[PDB]
């Protein structure tokens, strides 16, 4: 469906360019190395003290996001 959506998007953009024409008348190596890197990651596909701090920080952000959402909802009601 998505690729067909791309082809239909091509179709629609072309039809729009057409109704714009007739009636309205009058890097690559970087890409290669990037592919090599993605393939390398695919190949790759085939400390108890830290967890305290990490759980603590996830908890801190978990609290903060709450205030963020509350600010969003208050902004809503004000609007």
């Amino acid at each position: 469906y998505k690729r067909k959506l791309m082809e239909l998007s091509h179709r629609v953009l072309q039809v729009l360019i057409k109704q714009e024409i007739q009636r309205k008348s009058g890097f690559k190596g970087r890409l290669n190395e990037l592919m090599s890197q993605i393939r390398m990651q695919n190949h790759f596909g085939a400390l108890r003290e830290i967890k305290q701090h990490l759980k603590q920080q996830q908890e801190g952000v978990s609290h903060l996001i709450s205030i963020i959402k509350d600010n969003h909802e208050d902004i809503k009601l004000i609007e």
Binding site: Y1, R3, K4, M6, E7, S9, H10, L13, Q14, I17
Partner: protein, 683 residues
């Protein structure tokens, strides 16, 4: 005897009924399996009998048993493959043709042939053949009768069997009374297995060549009888039918029409034998229209190969120049390149001038046969083509070209284009052919709907046949392989092939599913045609940054965009959801299902080749797609292309899900029957 008997009790229907009685019939797979197994059993046993006969002739009683078996064999008018092989085995059995091969071991061969030592074999085979008991196939009775007659005639030239030397001539009479010629034409040659084993072709053709070679008095008698019958027939026609002569003619034309072993037996009928050339001549003299059709066919058959067709081209062309003849008679050989090319120019003038004394149907028949015959001669001898294309008084190329624009019946157009192709076989010819076709506007390449479009939409659609379109795509392809020019039609419109392209893709292919097929194989064949041209078209396409910068040409005063690298359009159609792509996929799914049927011949060979071309185009798009995407991404048509990969996982309309690849695989299940599609698929 046990071989004949076991093959005789092996009735596939009887075995099937027995198995269905005990419920022993497995799936259609298993059914085909056991059936092919039984057919293999019978065919192998028969092959053992035949190979035995080919190695060592069978004894007197064995041969009489074979005769008793054959005398009860039935056709269907064509004889069965196993029936044909049995008849042919007994044919090679009575074959005395090894007595005229000048090889030095003649004594040892005459002592290894059972027919020369046990006169009882001659007596008994003769008394069985001379029994008036009508074999269940009387045409087969007469066939064997003529065979035994020719064998007695060939053995009568050796001093040891004179007690039979007189029973050959009457035997042939009996055989000639039994429509032996017709039995040979329809039952065996008309059997689709005859041209399968080259040795069967050699046996049939050997008996055929021996027919006029060992008994010339009988051919003369048939000639006189056919002449008297032609006189009486003319008397009847003016006063408001035995087709012997036509039958022998067609038999000769068909038996040699193929030389799968390339033996060139037809070389006997041309003289660079004497009786053969003499008959080939005398049959051309005062040829009534009735045999004008058959004789050409015979001539076609006679042309089999380089040398024979060369002789035939010589025959026509010599019969076609300025030569005094006939003691001031109105016409010479009604079969003569003079008559051919002359009546041809006559029709061309009479028709171009009428642009109604329409061609009588019989005249159409004679013309069709003549075109086919010349086609065969040109095809088989390149000297024939070189001679015919350059004879100044015939100008057959320009004559046919003048004919084409004239409203002839479609079939004559088919035959004429067929001869056009037969002559085009030489490349020099093809060059002028391309130019002149571009000249005569047989297809409108310069629009100033008329033409093949309307006739396809109204005639070809109505008559439920599209021979015109098939010839059209055939010409298009033969031309496109010969490097069609980039400025095609430049001056009348935008240079580029796009017009014929749209005609093929929108009108023919995309509609090919909606057209009615009186012969179902036609849908498949027409798809095959369109596919061949689209394939070759893409196969040359090299993606270049020139294609994507729209070159502006001043055509007819308006700036039109020049056509891109020829396949670019096709690629844009395959790189998007074009009905073309879905049609490819639909033909794919349909072929997959049809294959799953595991079903016989109907439309098959064409169906295979079609799907194969489809896979080929798929591979080609995948192959070029990398550079094509690089170039398009470098020149930036807003055209969005998707790599064929993502499309292949498309959700199939019929399947409602991504089974394109799965279906594509499923052909791999049909490997052991179809190697080709498997190869393409795995690729």
């Amino acid at each position: 005897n046990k071989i004949l008997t076991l093959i005789s009790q092996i009735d596939v229907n009887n075995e099937f009924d027995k198995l269905k009685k005990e419920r022993g019939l497995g799936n259609k797979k298993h059914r085909k399996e056991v059936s092919d197994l039984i057919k293999e059993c019978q065919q192998s046993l028969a092959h053992s009998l035949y190979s035995w006969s080919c190695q060592t002739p069978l004894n007197r009683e064995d041969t009489l048993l074979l005769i008793g078996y054959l005398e009860k064999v039935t056709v269907e008018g064509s004889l069965d493959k196993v029936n044909l092989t049995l008849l042919m085995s007994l044919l090679y059995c009575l074959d005395v043709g090894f007595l005229e091969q000048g090889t030095d071991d003649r004594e040892e061969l005459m002592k290894q042939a059972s027919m020369f030592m046990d006169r009882q074999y001659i007596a008994a085979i003769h008394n069985r053949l001379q029994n008036t008991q009508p074999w269940k196939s009387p045409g087969m009775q007469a066939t064997v009768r003529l065979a035994w007659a020719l064998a007695l005639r060939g053995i009568s030239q050796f001093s040891e069997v004179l007690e039979f030397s007189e029973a050959d001539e009457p035997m042939a009479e009996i055989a000639i009374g039994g429509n032996v010629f017709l039995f040979l034409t329809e039952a065996v040659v008309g059997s689709e297995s005859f041209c399968t084993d080259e040795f069967f072709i050699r046996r049939i053709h050997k008996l055929v060549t021996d027919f006029p070679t060992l008994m010339p008095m009988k051919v003369k008698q048939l000639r006189n009888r056919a002449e008297e019958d032609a006189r009486l027939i003319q008397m009847s026609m003016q006063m408001g039918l035995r087709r012997d002569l036509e039958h022998l003619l067609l038999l000769i034309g068909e038996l040699y029409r193929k030389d799968p072993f390339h033996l060139e037996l037809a070389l006997e009928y041309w003289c660079p034998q004497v009786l053969l050339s003499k008959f080939v001549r005398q049959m051309s003299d005062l040829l009534p229209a009735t045999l004008y059709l058959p004789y050409l066919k015979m001539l076609r058959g006679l042309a089999s190969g380089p040398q024979c067709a060369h002789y035939c081209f010589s025959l026509l062309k010599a019969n076609g120049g300025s030569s005094a003849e006939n003691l001031q008679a109105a016409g010479g050989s009604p079969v003569s390149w003079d008559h051919f090319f002359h009546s041809l120019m006559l029709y061309h003038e009479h028709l171009r001038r009428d642009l109604l004394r329409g061609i009588t149907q019989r005249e159409l028949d004679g013309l069709i046969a003549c075109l086919q015959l010349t086609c065969t001669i040109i095809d088989w001898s390149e000297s024939a083509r070189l001679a015919l294309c350059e004879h100044a008084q015939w100008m057959p190329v320009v004559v046919i070209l003048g004919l084409l624009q004239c409203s002839i019946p479609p079939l004559l157009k088919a035959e004429l284009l067929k001869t056009l192709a037969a002559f085009g076989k030489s490349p020099e010819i093809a060059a002028s052919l391309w130019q002149s076709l571009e000249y005569t506007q047989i297809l409108q390449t310069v629009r100033a709907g008329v033409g093949i479009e309307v006739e396809l939409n109204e005639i070809e659609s109505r008559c439920e046949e599209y021979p015109l379109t098939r010839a059209f795509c055939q010409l298009i392809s033969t031309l496109v392989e010969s490097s069609f020019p980039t400025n095609l039609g430049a001056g009348l419109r935008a240079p580029g092939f796009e017009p014929y392209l749209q005609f093929l893709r929108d009108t023919v292919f995309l509609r090919y599913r909606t057209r009615a097929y009186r012969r179902a194989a036609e849908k498949w064949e027409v798809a095959e045609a369109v596919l061949d041209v689209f394939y070759k078209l893409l196969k040359d396409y090299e993606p270049q940054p020139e294609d994507f910068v729209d070159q502006y040409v001043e055509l007819q005063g308006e700036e039109r965009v020049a056509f891109k690298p020829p396949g670019f359009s096709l690629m844009h159609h395959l790189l998007n959801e074009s009905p073309m792509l879905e049609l490819c996929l639909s033909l794919m799914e349909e072929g997959v299902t049809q294959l799953d049927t595991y079903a016989p011949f109907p439309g098959k060979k064409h169906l295979e080749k079609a799907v194969a071309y489809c896979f080929m185009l798929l591979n080609l798009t995948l192959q070029k797609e990398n550079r094509f995407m690089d170039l398009l991404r470098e020149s930036h048509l807003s055209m969005i292309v998707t790599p064929l990969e993502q499309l292949l996982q498309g959700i199939n309309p019929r399947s409602k899900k991504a089974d394109n690849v799965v279906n594509i695989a499923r052909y791999l299940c049909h490997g052991n029957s179809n190697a080709e599609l498997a190869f393409e698929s795995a690729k």
